[PDB]
Amino acid sequence: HMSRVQLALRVPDLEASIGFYSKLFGTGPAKVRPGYANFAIAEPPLKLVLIEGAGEDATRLDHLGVEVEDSAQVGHAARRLKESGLATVEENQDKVWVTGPGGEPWEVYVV
Ligand code: NI
């Protein structure tokens, strides 16, 4: 209906995490690859991405994002974000990246 947040977690155990999230949100993954899984959750509106970690023992934040409706929304956000003094990097618009002050990366992207 509108844009949704994208939470990408680096997880130590991809299979265990798929099963927990399937129970948390009541649905199975939309896509499953080696080392990668994703969920398109309708309520709460969310794109949850699970990325299999290499070394560490605990789940960490990999990146955050805002999944918008069409490519045109990406360009609108890109223009909005720049007029604000935020340093943006565009991929070609299909994706814009900005980084928060503590280093957390955000992508605004069309799916
Ligand atoms: Ni992503």
Name the pairing type of β-strands 31-33 and 36-41.
antiparallel
Write the DSSP string, 74-85.
HHHHHHHHHHTT
Domain holding 55, by residue range, is 1-111
- Residues with Cβ < 8 Å from 53, sequence gap 6 or more? 10, 11, 12, 59, 60
Domain count across the chain: 1
Query: What is the whole-number distance in angstroms between the Cα of residue 83 and the centre of ligand 1?
Result: 24
Query: What is the whole-number distance in angstroms between the Cα of residue 79 and the centre of ligand 1?
Result: 20
Task: Check which CATH number belongs to the domain holding 90 and give it.
Answer: 3.10.180.10
Q: How was this structure determined?
A: X-ray
Cα dihedral angle (109, 4, 50, 88), rounded to 10 degrees? 30
What is the stated resolution of the deposited model, in angstroms? 2.0
